[PDB]
């Protein structure tokens, strides 16, 4: 955006003139190579929306137009990176850990739809959704991938290392757990208890891990 | 829409008064539509010669249509 | 024949001149 | 004009500061631009007079303090239109460009390399040294065009011998350009109208002239880099290329060789004669060999465009308006060709011209307007291109009609291929491997056709317009030519 | 009509002196063919600049027969 | 006052020396590269001579004592000084990358610059043989040394070494030239030379002293701007030292050179007996520069050889004596200088490659596509392609070429030009169009490369919407000589 | 005057040759280029004037008519 851009000059001009205009007496404080990742929900002419009730990992960055709701989180490494179109992850979901969640922008060559990501939804770890309207009380495996296009229907647990392929529509309740995606079998009810289940488990413990503090002990370990 | 016959001062040699000899042309060539133009005037007054007669439409005027003719010459 | 056109181009030229020459 | 001149100068200097990704700021406001250059060029042509040997809107700034080689800007007569024309021809190519993305073919990039009025320029430079920088200087713009969103055919190139030749043919005409600045200091082309030259050296210099110009003018022994730089030539480009780049031959012999040398050019009358003669004898012939769509619509503009040398030639006031008349009309009329066969390309992603077939089916107003533009490159009598064309004809009016007895087979051999092409693409229900993408023109498409349509329309029915604000101009050249 | 066209042409008039402006050009062109006949043609200017330090500094030294008598 | 612009940088040179001496040798600054130091506060002492030499413009010629017995300042010694330290100060700025990051310690590289620079300083203002000769040979000197410094590739040594040979034997042919013109007039001061001179005629006038002397000086001159018949290793002189020595000796002893040619030949000697070895130059110079550039791989190289043909299409403005002529030359000197500051500022920004020739220079339209379009520019106004600078240049000098009816040099050049232009353009399209060819890749080029690179491209295009300042200037320095 | 667009464009140039995005303060230093422009202009006019004056006294010389 052009007052964007004009925005970032000024800013720049400004942080210039900080570092030089007054660290000049003695001061390499700004030189030091502190991270930036801490970025967590990073921003364009789109922002990340996300509400209270919604624990984001600060070893985890969510970047481009994201709208975590309710309960959601995003737990330690995961990448909620959506600039193209909105990662519009619903309530009460439970990313878990290092997953990946991507309208991430190629050359139109399969015209990148937003990942609406329903409710409910314990993703495992690495997965590594992309293009994916994945429906409510969905379970995703540890390590798994997904495709583009992908609508995984209500209760389909996807397990562990699986691989979805292109536009397919996984019915609701069908088992798929394979690197050509390939249905397996009905799900069971304790299937469906544990994931109906995990997904509260996480909403409270994402509410925990309470993060919102500092240790200023470490910090002045660190410092010397 | 507002000229002047005279050119002001060219002699024959035209070489000399640029000024004047771009002059002669601009308005020697305004002699040259006036008698185009004449003979156009007098090309519709043939045709006006047709519209009056309308029964010999030929005659009448076409001896005077080689009068009109005669402000072209050389016609071999 | 192109050769044959293009001095029978320029004999249309001394046509013209031809022309030039009846005046 | 001193303010609304530098219209598209300016409207691309301050945009190169914008790189905007988001390309829908850099289209908007450089179509805009254009359009404004376009609409002052309109009113420029509306502040015409059509009484004067004078230019109409005369401005200057030193270049040389010593005989004072500057930007002399004059518009009389013929460079009104063709100002007129370039403008009316720019906007089509910023508006043939809409392309959703367009990222490789980096919008603002194509902007800014057609977004210069260097044409403008040339058309409105009347000092002949400057005058020859600028259809040399377009030669940049004009290349980057050609290829950088070109359609790559072959490894893009012209050929070698024949670029060498075209270029060192330009430079030769700069030669004869500084004998006659230094032949009595004479700078612009007012004084060296004025001025008188020796009748031995009026030849040399008219043919040195000649070479650079009979290479932008397409005559038969050098006219091979329409064809070979139309098919490789995007789809905005040919429509510049056919639009202006032709033009520049002619407007050159119009203004600088006519009234320049007259007892040269009386003396090459049967050479120039036969010369274009041939040449649209063999472009007519030709596309019987070329099955290639942009070469079959090339070749019929190096027919149209020796027809306006075959013209041109006349000390017939209607002898030179029906040669600037046809520039006007072919401006239009190829153009819009070539605006056709680019979408025929682009909505057939084919470069092969056996495969245009079922055009009825996928796009029928495509053969509407098809049909209503090659009625017009064969000059359908109605057609702005019959009144330049036949005025081209009756320019044997002081003469004897031996040339216009080759026009006779440069145009009627033209007017069958034009047919006979016209059916070869709209032929039959000659079903193509296009997986039922019919490709329907766009509202945008049919816009940008619209002028070209309502131009040749407006001329063919009502050519007074242009051949009025022209006939003062045109009569004085004549009387500097007696 | 439409309310102004008639002042709507005066946007020209005809200010008929871009002919003495093609006049004066002339002149300087006239002048301007002398351009490259033109070079060097004085011998008198300062180039002749050695003299003015000769009858200067001649009577220092460098002399036959002044330091003599 | 009236040698403040010499005063300066010989003072600023000592104090940069020492300078830069003490430090290198420092044990308690770690024996630090003074290179990049004495640089910076070198192109400093450049600027600051280029104000004290700007600015007391009425001041230089301050002085009588200096007249008729060293060196004789005016308009034109003044401009064309402007430009000699406006063409160093490129020069040094383009090199800031060579000292950091090649990596030189030897800070005397500057320094002997700045003497380089003092005695081309010198030379513009040279108005005695024996002044021309030792300025000269300053500058020569300099050259010599700073063209043999790297010591570790063997490829520079022996292109120094015969750069050096070429240089002392070209002096020494340009002093007998001395020797004879003295021997045979009993006078060394061109203002002495001149009143001698006036109506010499030596093929109307048996005079084969002073003829066998301007023909030596003209012989000598010829090898120092490496024209086309005396070139006789100056492609090799380019391609094998350093880049940015290449880039100092290749502009700016041609711009001193020239100018001094300017002095001895338009004035020492007015006659058109000697301008008919330069016709002759011109001629082969241009033919030269064309085949050669149309045959060579190597940048280095190929830049040579554009330059000697550069160098040809000068002397078609010295070809004749008219003032149109060497207002042409001067032109054709500043946008030949400016033109060739920006090629070897782009050769320097492509620090990564070895001795590479244009197929390892191509990917730039792909890599860096800015820096392409750039040395597009750069070698389209060598050609000569109209919206350009270099068109202007020779458009210019071909012009001037007709208007002293040298028809026939005016054809040559045309021709040359146009085989030119196909080659550049052939090359352009080569390096865009197609030919992929390896993707080296490079680190980028600095500020100082940056903005001149920028700089001068911007003249080169925007140079036809302004030429009156330029064209001022070279029709003033023509009537000043 | 056009002498600023210029500076800022040397400066973006520069910025575009070392691959550094079109950002920071320098831009507002393409004054300086503003202030050159005037200053060539300026000298442009000085310099026409000493060129007028050199073609006088060149007319003066080379003969004078005679
Ligand atoms: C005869 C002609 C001969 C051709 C050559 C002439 C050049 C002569 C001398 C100058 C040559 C080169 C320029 C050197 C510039 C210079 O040292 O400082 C400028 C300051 O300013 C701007 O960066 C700010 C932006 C400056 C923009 C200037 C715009 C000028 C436009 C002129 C009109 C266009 C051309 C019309 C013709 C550049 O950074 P700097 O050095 O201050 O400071 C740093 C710089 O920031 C670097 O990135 C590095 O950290 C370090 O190497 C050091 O350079
Ligand atoms: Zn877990």
New binding site residues.
């Given amino acids: 955006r052009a007052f964007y851009s004009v925005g970032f000059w000024i800013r720049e001009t400004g942080q210039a003139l900080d570092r030089l205009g007054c660290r000049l007496q003695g001061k390499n404080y700004f030189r030091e190579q502190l991270s930036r990742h801490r970025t967590l929900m990073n921003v364009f002419d789109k922002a990340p929306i996300v509400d209270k009730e919604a624990f984001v990992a600060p070893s985890a960055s969510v970047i481009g137009d994201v709208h975590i709701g309710r309960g959601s989180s995003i737990w330690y490494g995961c990448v909620l990176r959506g600039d193209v179109n909105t990662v519009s992850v619903g309530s009460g979901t439970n990313i878990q850990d290092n997953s990946l969640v991507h309208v991430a922008k190629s050359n139109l060559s399969g015209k990148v739809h937003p990942t609406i990501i329903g409710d409910n939804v314990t993703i495992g770890h690495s997965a590594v959704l992309h293009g994916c309207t994945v429906e409510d009380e969905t379970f995703i495996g540890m390590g798994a991938t997904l495709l583009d296009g992908v609508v995984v229907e209500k209760h389909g647990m996807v397990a562990a290392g699986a691989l979805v392929r292109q536009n397919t529509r996984i019915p609701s309740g069908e088992v798929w757990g394979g690197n050509p995606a390939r249905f397996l079998r009905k799900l069971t009810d304790e299937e469906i208890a544990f994931i109906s289940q995990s997904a509260t488990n996480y909403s409270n413990l994402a509410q925990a891990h309470a993060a919102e503090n500092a240790k200023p002990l470490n910090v002045i370990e660190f410092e010397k | 829409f507002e000229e002047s016959a005279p050119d002001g001062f060219d002699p024959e040699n035209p070489y000399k008064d640029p000024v004047a000899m771009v002059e002669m042309r601009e308005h020697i060539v305004r002699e040259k539509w006036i008698h185009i133009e004449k003979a156009k005037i007098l090309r519709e007054k043939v045709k006006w010669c047709y519209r009056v007669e309308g029964v010999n439409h030929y005659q009448k005027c076409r001896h005077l249509v080689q009068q009109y003719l005669d402000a072209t010459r050389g016609v071999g | 024949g192109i050769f044959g056109i293009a001095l029978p181009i320029i004999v249309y030229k001394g046509i013209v001149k031809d022309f030039h020459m009846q005046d | 004009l001193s303010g609304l001149i530098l219209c598209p100068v300016l409207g691309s200097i301050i945009l190169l500061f914008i790189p905007n990704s988001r390309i829908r700021l850099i289209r908007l406001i450089g179509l805009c631009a254009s359009l404004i250059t376009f609409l002052y060029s309109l009113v420029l042509w509306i502040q015409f007079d059509s009484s004067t040997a004078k230019f109409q809107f005369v401005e200057s700034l030193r270049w040389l303090p010593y005989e004072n080689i500057n930007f002399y800007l004059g518009i009389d007569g013929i460079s009104l239109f063709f100002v007129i024309l370039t403008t009316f021809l720019i906007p089509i190519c910023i508006l043939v460009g809409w392309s959703g993305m367009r990222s490789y073919g980096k919008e603002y990039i194509i902007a800014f390399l057609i977004c210069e009025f260097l044409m403008i320029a040339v058309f409105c430079m009347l000092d002949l040294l400057l005058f020859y920088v600028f259809p040399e200087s377009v030669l940049i713009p004009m290349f980057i065009i050609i290829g950088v969103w070109g359609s790559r055919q072959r490894k893009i190139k012209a050929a070698y011998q024949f670029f060498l030749y075209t270029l060192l043919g330009s430079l030769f005409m700069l030669l004869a350009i500084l004998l006659i600045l230094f032949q009595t200091g004479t700078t612009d082309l007012q004084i060296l109208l004025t001025t008188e030259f020796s009748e031995r050296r009026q030849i040399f210099l008219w043919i040195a002239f000649f070479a650079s110009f009979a290479v932008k003018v397409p005559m038969v022994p050098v006219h091979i880099w329409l064809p070979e730089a139309h098919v490789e030539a995007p789809t905005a480009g040919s429509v510049i290329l056919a639009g202006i780049l032709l033009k520049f031959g002619t407007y050159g012999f119009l203004r600088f060789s006519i009234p320049m040398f007259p007892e040269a050019t009386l003396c090459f009358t049967p050479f120039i004669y036969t010369l274009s003669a041939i040449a649209i004898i063999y472009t007519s012939l030709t596309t019987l060999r070329q099955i290639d769509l942009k070469k079959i619509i090339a070749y019929s503009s190096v027919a149209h465009m020796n027809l306006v040398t075959i013209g041109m030639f006349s000390p017939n006031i209607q002898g030179i308006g029906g040669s600037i008349l046809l520039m006007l009309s072919h401006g239009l009329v190829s153009s819009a060709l070539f605006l056709c066969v680019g979408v025929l390309y682009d909505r057939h992603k084919t470069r092969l011209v056996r495969y245009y077939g079922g055009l009825v089916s996928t796009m029928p107003n495509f053969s509407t307007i098809f049909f209503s533009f090659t009625l017009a490159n064969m000059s359908l009598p109605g057609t702005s291109s019959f009144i330049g064309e036949f005025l081209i004809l009756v320019g044997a009016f002081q003469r004897n009609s031996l040339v216009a007895t080759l026009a006779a087979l440069g145009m009627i051999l033209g007017a069958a291929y034009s047919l006979w092409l016209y059916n070869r693409v709209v032929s039959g229900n000659l079903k193509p491997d296009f997986l039922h993408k019919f490709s329907d023109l766009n509202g945008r498409e049919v816009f940008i056709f619209i002028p070209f349509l309502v131009g040749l329309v407006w001329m063919g029915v009502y050519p007074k317009v242009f051949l009025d604000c022209m006939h003062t101009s045109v009569s004085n050249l004549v009387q500097h030519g007696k | 009509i439409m309310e102004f066209a008639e002042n709507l042409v005066l946007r020209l008039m005809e200010n008929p002196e871009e002919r003495d402006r093609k006049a004066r050009e002339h002149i300087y062109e006239m002048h301007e063919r002398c351009k490259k006949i033109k070079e060097m043609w004085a011998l008198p200017i300062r180039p002749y600049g050695f003299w003015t330090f000769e009858r200067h500094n001649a009577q220092l030294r460098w002399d036959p027969q002044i330091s003599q008598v | 006052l009236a040698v403040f612009p010499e005063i300066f940088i010989i003072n600023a040179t000592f104090i940069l020396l020492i300078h830069g001496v003490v430090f290198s040798t420092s044990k308690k600054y770690d024996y630090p590269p003074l290179a990049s130091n004495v640089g910076?506060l070198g192109?400093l002492s450049?600027?600051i001579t280029l104000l004290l030499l700007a600015a007391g413009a009425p001041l230089l010629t301050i002085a009588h004592l200096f007249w008729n017995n060293l060196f004789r300042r005016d308009n034109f010694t003044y401009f064309c000084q402007?430009?000699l330290l406006?063409?160093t100060?490129?020069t040094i700025?383009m090199c800031?990358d060579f000292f950091d990051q090649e990596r030189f310690d030897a800070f005397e590289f500057i320094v002997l610059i700045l003497l380089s620079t003092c005695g081309m300083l010198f030379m513009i203002s040279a108005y005695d043989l024996i002044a021309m000769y030792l300025a000269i040979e300053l500058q020569s000197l300099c050259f010599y040394v700073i063209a043999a410094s790297k010591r570790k590739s063997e490829f520079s040594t022996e292109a120094g070494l015969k750069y050096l040979i070429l240089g002392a034997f070209s002096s020494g042919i340009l002093l007998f030239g001395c020797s004879m013109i003295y021997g045979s007039t009993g006078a060394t001061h061109f203002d002495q030379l001149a009143k001698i001179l006036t109506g010499y005629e030596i093929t109307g006038a048996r005079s084969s002293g002073i003829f066998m002397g301007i023909l030596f000086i003209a012989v000598g001159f010829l090898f120092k701007i490496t024209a086309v018949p005396f070139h006789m290793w100056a492609p090799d002189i380019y391609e094998g030292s350093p880049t940015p020595v290449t880039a100092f000796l290749s502009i700016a002893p041609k711009i001193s050179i020239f100018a001094n040619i300017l002095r001895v030949f338009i004035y020492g000697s007015y006659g058109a007996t000697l301008q008919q070895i330069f016709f002759f130059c011109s001629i082969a110079s241009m033919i030269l520069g064309a085949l050669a550039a149309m045959a060579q791989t190597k940048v280095k190289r190929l830049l040579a050889y554009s330059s000697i043909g550069h160098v040809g299409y000068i002397c078609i403005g010295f070809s004749c004596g008219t003032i149109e002529g060497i207002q042409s030359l001067l032109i054709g000197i500043?946008i030949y200088?400016?033109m060739t500051?920006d090629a070897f500022a782009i050769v320097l920004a492509l620090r990564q490659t070895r001795v590479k020739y244009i197929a390892d220079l191509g990917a730039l339209a792909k890599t860096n596509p800015i820096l392409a379009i750039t040395f597009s520019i750069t070698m389209f106004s060598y050609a000569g392609i109209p919206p350009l600078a270099g068109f202007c240049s020779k458009f210019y000098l071909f012009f001037a070429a007709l208007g002293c009816g040298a028809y026939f040099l005016a054809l040559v050049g045309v021709v040359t030009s146009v085989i030119g232009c196909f080659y550049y353009i052939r090359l352009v399209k080569r390096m865009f169009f197609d030919t992929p060819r390896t993707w080296i890749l490079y680190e980028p080029m600095?500020?100082?490369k940056?903005?001149?690179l920028?700089?001068?491209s911007?003249?080169i295009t925007?140079?036809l919407l302004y030429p009156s300042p330029l064209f001022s200037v070279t029709h003033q320095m023509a009537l000043s000589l | 005057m056009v002498?600023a667009l210029?500076?800022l464009?040397?400066?973006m140039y520069?910025n575009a040759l070392?691959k550094l995005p079109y950002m920071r303060h320098?831009?507002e230093?393409?004054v300086?280029?503003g202030l050159?422009?005037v200053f060539?202009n300026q000298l442009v006019k000085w310099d026409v004037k000493l060129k007028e004056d050199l073609d006088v006294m060149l007319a003066k010389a080379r003969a004078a008519n005679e």
Avoid: C, E, Y
Wanted: hydrophobic letters at 60%.
């Fill in positions: 910076w192109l450049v600027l402007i430009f406006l063409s100060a490129g700025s800031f500043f200088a400016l500051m600095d500020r100082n940056s903005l001149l920028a700089m001068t911007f003249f925007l140079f | 002498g210029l500076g464009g040397t400066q520069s070392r320098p831009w230093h393409v300086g280029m050159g422009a060539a």
